[PDB]
Symmetry: C2
């Protein structure tokens, strides 16, 4: 069923930020499964407890981009998220028009693994044919980015996209207003912004932007929207300017604005991908298959020189995730002679760029990690860099590797982890049970601060300690008790 798959996607698969295709932003030890729709129904049915503050804060997870710029993913508190997901499920007949939006490529869709939101799920076949069909006969390409699609989207504009702005103003119940209310409750009862990473906020953004897509489609524009990025194909240059103008009016109707720095008009034919993508693939040592596995095994010189050229392209161009693309090109065609060289190169690049840290888990088995403790020092230096740069993705993945592979962590970097206080990193540290007293001191400071949003920012740590009977429930409601009684575990075993 579409409805049941939507419910299980919202809670069991796309609650945590898990929208990436190949490697996740979060280590795989964190999983939102065993959090079923029945449990969320029981949470939403709970009315006990008193909150001094209105709304709920969320666990914040800082993941670096390719330019080391932090992006704040969020894990919503399960009470507010359960209510929001239940409301989205209950009115899915009125919401599912976002599925039949041909212009939006990244939208809800029934996937095999159980998700609804997967970025870049479509294959290169249909992708290539689609951009060649859209770009045919047109000599201008328009790239326009919404400035604040996650950070300043208007929750009160959720009705305005559904029934119209004027009709929603006269009408002030409808499901869109309740969706607005629950989306506000998801983040501290704040009217602006949505948590990045869950599919509920992606559904809300699709609902808001579907009216803009419909208005642009009714004017005859050929365009594709990936989340917030619009790519339009225009026969003439005034058509590009008119698309930009009409998109500006349609975004300003819902209190949104184009990123004036990011919008650009290029001459077709450009490239189907970015230019660095073709530069990398045309220089890839693994670009041709041989159908025998011994032939397509890369040597040391090939991979080392290709990664050096990738660093050259990242410095010179820097138009995207060049290093991650090249590493994913060469990481699966390695032989056992060259594992140490590529692994040390990945360690250096991952110290410089934390987004390359998860690739260390690809070759984490072949590398003799005991050795002469040099790898322990390198991993702890990576942990120091992650604590200094305040990035949660690299620290979480490195801590996952150290816990799984029994790499020892010094006390000095544990002090830096507590000073940073990333919720997922502290969840991993609590799951190791070595550092119980420091986690206890941290959560005691959070409790004695008596701020409800401070507890909400570490609800996952508090629930992981409560579920293992290491700490009482910080809240006075029954949501944590309901989740513990039905065996909800966000750090499950295999």
């Amino acid at each position: 069923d579409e409805k049941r798959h939507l419910y299980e996607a919202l809670l069991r698969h796309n609650y945590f930020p898990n929208q990436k295709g190949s490697i996740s932003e979060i280590p795989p030890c964190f999983s939102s499964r065993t959090f079923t729709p029945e449990i969320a129904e029981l949470i939403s049915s709970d009315t006990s407890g008193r909150r001094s503050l209105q709304g709920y804060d969320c666990v914040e997870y800082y993941a670096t981009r390719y330019n080391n710029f932090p992006r704040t993913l969020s894990i919503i508190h399960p009470k507010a998220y359960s209510k929001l997901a239940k409301h989205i499920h209950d009115n899915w007949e009125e919401i599912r028009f976002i599925k039949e939006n041909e212009n939006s490529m990244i939208k809800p869709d029934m996937h095999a693994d159980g998700r609804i939101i997967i970025m870049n799920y479509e294959d290169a076949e249909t992708k290539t044919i689609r951009e060649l069909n859209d770009g045919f006969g047109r000599r201008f390409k328009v790239n326009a980015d919404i400035s604040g699609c996650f950070t300043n989207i208007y929750s009160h504009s959720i009705p305005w996209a559904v029934i119209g702005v004027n009709n929603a103003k006269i009408a002030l119940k409808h499901w869109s207003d309740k969706l607005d209310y629950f989306q506000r409750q998801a983040k501290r009862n704040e009217t602006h912004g949505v948590p990045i990473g869950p599919a509920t906020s992606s559904i809300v953004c699709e609902i808001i932007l579907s009216a803009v897509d419909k208005r642009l489609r009714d004017d005859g524009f050929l365009f594709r929207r990936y989340i917030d990025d619009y790519t339009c194909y225009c026969k003439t240059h005034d058509d590009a300017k008119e698309f930009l103008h009409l998109l500006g009016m349609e975004l300003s109707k819902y209190k949104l604005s184009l990123n004036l720095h990011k919008t650009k008009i290029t001459n077709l034919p450009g490239t189907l991908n970015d230019n660095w993508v073709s530069l990398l693939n045309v220089n890839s040592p693994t670009k041709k298959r041989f159908t025998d596995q011994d032939l397509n095994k890369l040597s040391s010189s090939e991979v080392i020189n290709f990664l050096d050229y990738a660093v050259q392209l990242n410095t010179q161009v820097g138009g995207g995730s060049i290093l991650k693309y090249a590493i994913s090109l060469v990481i699966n065609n390695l032989d056992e002679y060259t594992i140490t060289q590529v692994y040390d190169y990945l360690l250096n690049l991952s110290w410089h760029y934390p987004m390359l840290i998860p690739y260390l888990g690809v070759l984490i088995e072949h590398v003799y990690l005991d050795d002469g403790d040099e790898y322990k020092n390198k991993f702890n230096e990576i942990l120091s860099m992650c604590a200094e740069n305040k990035c949660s993705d690299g620290m979480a993945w490195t801590l996952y590797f150290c816990i799984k592979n029994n790499i020892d962590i010094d006390d000095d970097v544990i002090e830096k982890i507590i000073c940073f206080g990333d919720c997922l990193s502290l969840c991993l540290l609590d799951s190791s049970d070595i550092y119980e007293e420091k986690i206890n001191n941290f959560v005691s400071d959070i409790i004695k601060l008596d701020y409800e949003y401070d507890i909400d920012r570490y609800w996952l740590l508090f629930y992981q300690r409560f579920f293992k009977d290491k700490a009482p429930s910080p809240y006075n409601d029954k949501c944590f008790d309901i989740m513990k009684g039905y065996g909800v575990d966000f750090m499950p075993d295999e």
Copy 2:
């Protein structure tokens, strides 16, 4: 008195966006004078009326920057602004520590004209000596911009800057919490963002950033802050990185972040101003005084070629307001032979860049505006461009010029002005009394929409129609009646 000057600055001078030094963002026909502190006290004392919505929306005024990027200035509704200014005045002893912040250059200060916030009020003497003293012995200059100092500043962080974050969390009355509440009431009871242009929000931003400045000052950093832009002078490069890191932690303490695109580290000695500033002044035809007025009168070739070079510099460099700087260099040294050439050049540049539109008022007397109606067509084409580009500064200044100088406006562009619906432009159109029925239809649509924020977005138009007895008061409170009874006029005569 400092307190009385603060009150009269907040209400009579710096209510409207009037922080610019030479030419204002708003035409001079708009003035916030005759809105005295006694009147605001009477407004804040009023408790009658009922609002379905919480908070007040504000008049939005889109002013272009040098790159034609819109910046949204705001005129706060006089009830919320009166309460906010009264609360800022009543606790000025606890607020006035922002005056004694040596690192912040643009801060409240007792000025001769009655304002407290004037950008770049200090003379070139003290400016030049200050950047030469700060840059001496240091070889690195750090430019770091706060990303959302106006658009995502946290109102609940107003107590956190005053008494500390932890103490404000335990404390949950104090004046900072009430200041937070009134600042929220200024913009639709929204916890994020401040209206740009009034000095109350500048005071709030100074309060929030003063703790960051104190923390950076206590670590021995030599730095200067202009609004949101930090410029630090460092002996070594790690000192620059450590300043960037500590500023990141101090901003993240109050839910602020650096603009990672804008931050840069340059090598001292650079230039005291920007590089294009010295390029313009070293090529300025008026750069040397002669002490006789006939000698320093620029010819046609001099000004035309200097403006052509200014357009060349704006295209090639584009690092700032190059065209406005060069125009202000040459606009006051013109002779009567060259008025037509420079005025036509300004008309072309002002069509392309609306921020140059106010300079048309410098030579608006010498130009024979009747002529053969060509200037009427040029002004109406400028009005068409302002309606299409959705800019309020250029449209407001052009409408002010047309009303003052009796330039006729066609009905076709009046349709575009109503379609744009800028509040200040419609205030000017209502003050001309020619277009009464169209303004009546517009305000009838706003009234029949029954949205309180929609009335708040055009409160200035509604009050200008109410004060001239052309329309009844849209609100049910006594604020408009109090302002009318004491003769408050935001469009006063000379």
